[model samples]
Target chain A: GAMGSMERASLIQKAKLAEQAERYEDMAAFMKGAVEKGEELSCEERNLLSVAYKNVVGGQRAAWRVLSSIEQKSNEEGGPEVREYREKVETELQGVCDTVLGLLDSHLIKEAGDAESRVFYLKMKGDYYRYLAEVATGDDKKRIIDSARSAYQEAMDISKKEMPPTNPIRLGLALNFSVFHYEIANSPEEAISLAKTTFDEAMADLHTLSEDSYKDSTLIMQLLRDNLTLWT
Target chain B: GAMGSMERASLIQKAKLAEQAERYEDMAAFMKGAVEKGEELSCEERNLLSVAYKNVVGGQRAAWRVLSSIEQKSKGPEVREYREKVETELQGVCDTVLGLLDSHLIKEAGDAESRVFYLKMKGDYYRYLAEVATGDDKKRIIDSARSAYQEAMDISKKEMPPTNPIRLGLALNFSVFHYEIANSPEEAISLAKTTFDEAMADLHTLSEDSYKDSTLIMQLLRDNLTLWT
Candidate 1:
């Protein structure tokens, strides 16, 4: 209690550094400390808290909700400190969308990279396309959702073809893959069967998720819950 | 006489297809043929003709004026087709300008002026896209539009002679583009101020009898730009 208020500021700085380095696990832990301290954080810290949650501790959905705080920061006079981040946050999200789109459009994804890299790219390609589908409409939206499904399958096929499984990646992939089939409106019965089969197979590997701590990357067990809540 | 009613039907088909693909240049020629048929077009035909002119032959000032006809068409009880055209009209105008330009590139390497026009149109298109889009998409599109405007200006200076109407029109567009995407009261103050001064001077030198609309355009440009100028 002696260093209570200052400790939050200290912990937030460390979290920002971890986020900067993209050591997502460390970032998440430090952010977890800052948040639990229950001290007041500046708007910048609040925005970073969203980023840490988006990338790590709670996952994408939690981060999405926290994004409103960033908007509020921008609206409150849009001072340069927050405005810089406002522009940057938009760029970062758009940059990812464009990168995935570019990768999908490129001829290289069909042939380039080793299996691990290729699989990860495909998974990310799937993830980002799904993000785009949220805003898109009609046949355009359909094309995006279907493309995401296609990319995830390609990743799954590749990972399965590989010799040894990378614990959490393989499991999380299957979990999302299950939802992919299950989520489509008026989807085939095969979606139900596929979900059941993948869940059975991937569950065996699910225990390994604790080691990497879900902070290593974007796909994690948190949004796996998102998939479950949606289907059930 | 041989090119009468049958050709009008054919032209209508061709223009409709071009509109779908955003190829208003090709669409414009066909619609021009229909308009020159000496018979006045119905409200539907009239709107399509306006799109072609807006995208290809006339540019936005022409498009702006043509839009009034749609307003008039909808005044009395709002003919559903007329209102639909008005609602989607800006997107249609933007899509056509670059749609034709895009296909133009694939068809031929195309001329330098055509490339300049395409860049300019893309800037115009993205500016409109930025207007309707929200949040990140809006901010991103404005950036895209800004670079498009920058590229158009760069090409106009290097490729087209200063006196060319294309360059002058692009200069006018460049100034306005800065105004729209600009974050501040003046993003490129000197750049905009100088361009407007030159354009105003250029118009003033033209013979009053030949260029009767010169003052009107100058006044309109000045009126619209008072915020920044």
Candidate 2:
């Protein structure tokens, strides 16, 4: 209505441009700023926020993986400096995950105005915790794993009840949850079971996808099968 | 001999990874930090520095072009402000990159090969600066670019093999400079023709590493030759 709307749109546009340039850090910063201000984000804006944060978090995770691998290969106990560098990378990785987790819990989920957005945020919550669980240990690791599974189950419950098989958000939730079972949950059988179930239902509902949702719906459909193929 | 060398390699490696991920701004920052420390650069490190700055500068120039186009059509205050902001950043990128090249990088170049490489880059940034400049400044920048390119071409001939990719790249860019900035297509045509003919004559001398790059620039030279003629 006022400059608020204009400013949000401007921020979204900046985020989109940053994403295009592979400047995910800048993209996340812009979207984070946009979401900081009070406004119910549009579907497009919400997706932009998801995309920005996901890529920013993914890149940090990648760096951490490489650093940890290098540290693992170093001389027994590694050198002090090598250990320090890996620790620094892990700290940055966890910091980004925590930042995005806070944003999802405090703002995005509360402001989500649709079933689509609610499932998206919940699924994203589980996704980040799964990432955190990768580096967690002992009781803390088990606790994060439980938290991740709880969030995914809640998201699955909502999607199964509220969203159609043809919906992209619902389909994406299925794809991610299946991946959670496979990778984080350490249950290939459970992963294949969920994926095959989603695949069969979505196959039957393929004709129900609307023109707007068709592309997104089918893309997730392909990804679902991609995981099934590899798993089998 | 110790951590100094280790730190420089680490910085260069970080810059390389940043470049690989298309994080050119970070790439430039890491390379800039490496060059800031008093150390002579290896050839790969120098090329990494060039790759980083070129991409960073290219992105800003692209953004400026987009903003300037919109600003020209709309004539709105917001558009004007955004356009100027982009232009200022563009100028800053060019200034910083050019300063790095000029301030001891060219003179400290360890050999004729490095000298030609740096000179070619100096011409490139000047040409980029000329793209947005006007009047006397533009003219001065263009002359500086021409001088730099001429110097690069002269040394490259004496130092590098004719079929060397860097030599061919220098010819390609220098011809581009003459045709684009100098507005002398005939000069571009003649330079490109001579370079191509010489490259073809020396094609047998190209190493496996240079074969593909050498051929690619040779094709580009001929394409420009056809376009100019």
Candidate 3:
């Protein structure tokens, strides 16, 4: 057990390092290894590994789009367009969004039943919304934000009902809603309130739930935290 | 225009009939042709063709899974366990969910944006969720419901941000949430109320936003209605 645990831990650490280095493919490989080799790990561990793998794949896919856009734009302009990169970025970004959207539409949510997969879906959705908001302008930006708000609200709604009263879905939703308010809506008060609600809900859950359940609950929290760090 | 529209309609009707007959591969071929040939059609006409195409592909995939399961089961008693069947169904179902979620995840979330892809996502997510719930027991049923809820929530979170291109992301989220609630936690009034409040926020914006600003609003709503129906 210790050997397996140590191997998994080492693999996770490598994944983290690779992820930080923006080597998503490598990160996915490491995490996949961790999942396959860690025989003694629990369901949560497996879930986390799967999430990492998915994220790595998703991120790598996005990065590829960025690179491809750069190449395409260069070819179109007969030179590099650093200033025009935004346009290229937008096109590639939309493509990535569309591809991911197609996947979600056809596969992920329909099959998702476990806590891990669901949380990952929420995280992916949130990230995509954030990307849209960041890249879009004028009516486009507003529409993107509106869509993101719907997504966060839905996630919140699901969290509110499915898990125990104290589950972290509410917290994740609240934080996401706060992001919508602060960044998109420009309503600091709303953002603060939502953030506070998220914190409060999470704290309440922590007090009453078993340690294992609480730990499991934190998965989404960690995801939201990572999103916040990246987006905010 | 009328003649072309009627022609497209006839093709679509044929595709639907094939779907009903479980002739999925035939349906897919017919639908694919309709899409390829509809290059000169208006957005509205194209939208209808697109939906037919999606259904044909989805139906084909579902039929394959069902037939595959039966074949696998027929091979031996050991493979015919309900758990195995459930697992196979879940895999197929997840593929559908992933497709829908990914499509919505990528699109702008406003009324003026393209609803064709988003509607497909919504319809597919709902359909697969329903399919998975059909024969499951309480525990499996709960699991299936939970999975759907999570997927819907996940897709909503990703696509329904405040600054996405289309504005009805919130409405879509609410729509999916309502379905999730209807199927999973109908007894939980408080939770449902919370979902409604979230929906209201989006609904308010939808109503107040200018037509010029919300150009795609009506179409998105129409798409939502169609998917829900």
Candidate 4:
């Protein structure tokens, strides 16, 4: 499974070439593939792969933001490339966001009737908050964080209200709240408390979840616990 | 001055006829003019005129909402009368709001440099919200309200750090917000708070403005205050 140093270097070289050519879409896919193939490589190689993917994907997304801003302007003096690129980025951003929102909504709806579904939806919603927090700026960032907190609170409220008390859902809600605090709240002390609460709740939930659900819950709990331990 | 019962009834009949004929633009204009000619009418006639303007404007705006929803649907069946009515209403609504907002923005900009321009932009943003919120169902109502809030907030944030020019820029913002809340807001309390804050900020700035420099801001604030008060 190990790629030789020369092979890894060549793959990275190709990725850089694609990036320089402004073929970010191609570069992102290529770098992602290299990461998977070079899994046995040293930690430095894995980190390099991550940086390459982040750069390419970030570049592609930034292009969309610029396009959105420019498209709002009158077109009396704009060029063909400007117009075409603006349209392309707008279409792509809309398509991607719509797809993601739809996926999250459907997953939430389907999982609404059961405790397990509730837990899954809560985690998914938190993931969305993290995603938004990473990209949103100024008031937009504040709004997203506020919305995410509301979602997390709702999940926590429901988990407590349900009969038999579903700890997994509670834990997931707590973990999501912690992640939001860490990434978006602009308060590290709050983040540590939230992370600790998530770990404690998730550990308590381990015994209550069914055998089939236990593996997934344990995996999530472990991740949360590790995150808290590392940071705290 | 007082209008007799027959005179008030006649005005309502004319307004209704114009509405039924799909001459909403004319109906709005007529009703608005009647409201302005309040000195010639009794209190009852003035009240009736005000109600008539609201209904006609609301219906006109609703037609646009239905049309936009249909347009968004691919291969959607054409509702000819509905589409025409919506297009007409949208034009009427735009004209009405733009006139009101421009007047307000110009008036407010003349008054003070500290006012947020985003507040002025609220008028257009809220108009968009009113357009989206025209349906009868609860889901539709919530969606419309949320969309309006989202849009209004976006316009409000466009002028950041709230400088003098930016505050003045928000004349459009307050106009749209005022217009939308005037039509719909499930929670009147929250809506009232927001509108009051926006209106007060706008009015305070306009009141201090000099006639030469703040003509537009003063006119808009005056017009808005006249209508709402």
Candidate 5:
């Protein structure tokens, strides 16, 4: 047998959690090796890959927010200190986003074996662009928003067709896509409608879920309710 | 097989480290369970046992130090604020120390090696209690600390070499007790100086296994001597 196929699924599940404990570099190492070998990823490795990049990129994006805030408050001609650090900060954030975005487009979504993996990768694609758009401006911001909207719409369509109403992955996609409508597109009603519809449908399907997906599905369902109330 | 013996060695080795990484409560649970079952412990488990108690008691001891400092600095009426919390605070520190002191883990050390190890540990906790105690309590604790260090010192000298790391540790800790609790800097300096000199003369005879530990303890003795002198 080959090293990965015919292997125990428990070993793969353990790898997900073992790397899930913020051993992001280890997760990134195997994912990159698989990519280099042109090997396709299962949903488990795809999740491991996204979680690793989310935290890795999330940290830089947070730091960039702090620097941006400080830069905005500086005196005319800007503070010499923030000016010195801001370029490096912005460049690193964009570099990480570009690497993950390229991997998703070229490999992850192209080779996803299931609907969950497909929606997961596409939601991630939209997410990384949203990260980029946070710091982008004018036409650059517009271009990134357009790319985010395109990826999210495709994922939403797949979620509608293939995923159950109470599935966490599908509910998570609706949550993020609805967030994009509210924040990036400046369309509050559309975001609110999406949130309300998803919450009601999920409630109707609530009793049908197994215990494993029930907790996760209900949590995201609550977030949808919170967003609808907040938006309206 | 009715046993942890013949079990995979790697698993037990991992358990030592697994509990070692400060999941101290987990370490305490298993050790206390084993003690209840009247099971004997290997040196590895004994070490895990001691380390578990050290940290469990260690945290309370640290909190007591902070509160003691605050209590000492308060104005008249004994600063009714600290007076309120200090009783409960000191009670916990003494409770944790007393529990370990009376436990079989210390009473039944399997050999001179473990005896010295546990005896040194006992001195350490009593020294911690002595830090915040007063009147008869202070007097009794200081006496206990002195007796513990004395027995540990006697055992190490008789049963271990001058170059063994644990003997050097006993010498260092005993000297610390003299300087800190006994308030005798000269005695502290003398003990540290003698240990450093003897260990230096016998340094070449130190085993390769003990090289790093012995050298590190030697450096501590050297540091203490420099500070005291």
Candidate 6:
């Protein structure tokens, strides 16, 4: 049956709220099914898809699947930046990476249409690899970081060819991409500056862009602003 | 026992929220308790009290000592504008009885008792606006004033017979609004004769509803008419 317009409108509203709460897993489930029910993926839909799918594949619970991850028992919230997987759950990293990689490929294959689209997809792939590296052990961690680097470079190569000197989309992509430069290393001033300069330049052209696209750029820009406050 | 200042402020804050939500009964309860705790009721505090008490009494909540009663609801944007009004009225209450209705009323009401109070407040405020304005600007305010009194007459007409205090009170005020903006010198005397005659004519139709204080408003109207005439 064709989707009812009102029903889609309501669900789309709910999907927006899920993104607001950082409930990416819920966002993916909401928009994925909406598309299946005659909801064409809109701007943020495709852009969020790669990262949302990566999160769900990386043991981030969908709204239904909460207890699937009581893997940490510590007083976690105020203790530190992140909690680790319980020792027994250490074996799950490879499996999480495999599923995430598959999800990334699925979007890349389905949306083999535009160069800029692939930029987000590949960057999300790099991000997923970085997460796996953070939790991996010994040689496993080193290999994953290197794999993440390769994906990052490939994405930049595609972006470099197509993006103008200072594109909002590229500006957002650069800030997110530069996360790998300093996120895990926690040691690079130059790495952080590169991301800031991107924002500083892109914002110079803000009035020329419509708010629809400006919103996503601002959200990603906030993360790097947080990056400055955290690192510097 | 003396309530802590913190606790008193907390109660006042809750009352503010209740007023925002249109929960007039809750607003009065919260505010009254704060005052009992020896708290100073702020500007908005008394304004809402007038509204809540007027509602409680006028509605014949049948329980309020001096208009004790309750009504419940949620907030709307219009509530913000009204709350600002209560704030602005906070400047000078300087009316309680109908004699001061002109002064006290330049500020604010809600239901039958509340409804009469609201219409009276509205008409008086508009009248005040006209007094401060010049020319056609005053004319528009005058029109609005008459309209409000007309509403009061409308509501009273439905509830009581023609001679009801609510209707009489409304017509007395409305007749003055007609006279205040009278154009030609002939207009004032003509309206004085016609309007005063209508008030007297409209009176035989009133009820015993305001037998206690209804005369308060009508008496003022009569004196004002005598002086002007």
Ranking according to lDDT, highest score first: 2, 5, 1, 6, 3, 4
TM-score: model 4 vs. ground truth: 0.29
Docking quality category of candidate 1 according to DockQ thresholds? incorrect
Error of 4 at A153 (Å): 1.6
Cα displacement (angstroms), candidate 2, residue B29, comes to 3.8
Candidate 4 has a DockQ of 0.01
- Tens-digit per-residue lDDT, B1-229, candidate 1: 3235436666666566556545566567677566546554554675586577666533333333343354564423323332243335555656654564454321224455665665776776776655545688778887888887787788777776443455555666666666655554465455545655765656645654635344444454565567665
TM-score of each: 0.31, 0.81, 0.33, 0.29, 0.48, 0.36
Tens digits of per-residue lDDT for model 6 on B55-147?
Answer: 433322121111111112443232233233332332222122222333333233324544664576577556645543568776777777777
Chain B TM for prediction 4: 0.31
Ranking by TM-score: 2, 5, 6, 3, 1, 4
Chain B: TM-scores of all predictions: 0.53, 0.90, 0.32, 0.31, 0.79, 0.43
- DockQ of each candidate, alpha-carbon based: 0.01, 0.17, 0.01, 0.01, 0.02, 0.01
Candidate with the greatest TM-score versus the true structure: 2
Clashing pairs in 2: none
3 or 6, greater by TM-score: 6
Encode model 4's per-residue lDDT on A1-232: one tens digit a residue: 2323324445565555444434344444555445545234343443444344445435436665555455456464342433444454445544444434444464333432565455445555655555556555798778877777776776767666662322545655666677777767877788788767656655665687789778767766776777777777
Assign candidate 4 its CAPRI class.
incorrect
lDDT string, candidate 2, A25-135, tens digits: 767877887887767678888888888888877877777776666667776554254455556557777898898898887778864477777888899899899889888
Model 2 misplaced regions, further than 4 Å: A1-6, A16-25, A59-95, A135-143, A207-215, B1-6, B13-27, B61-90, B134-140, B157-161, B201-209
Q: Where does candidate 5 stray beyond 4 Å?
A: A1-21, A75-78, B1-229
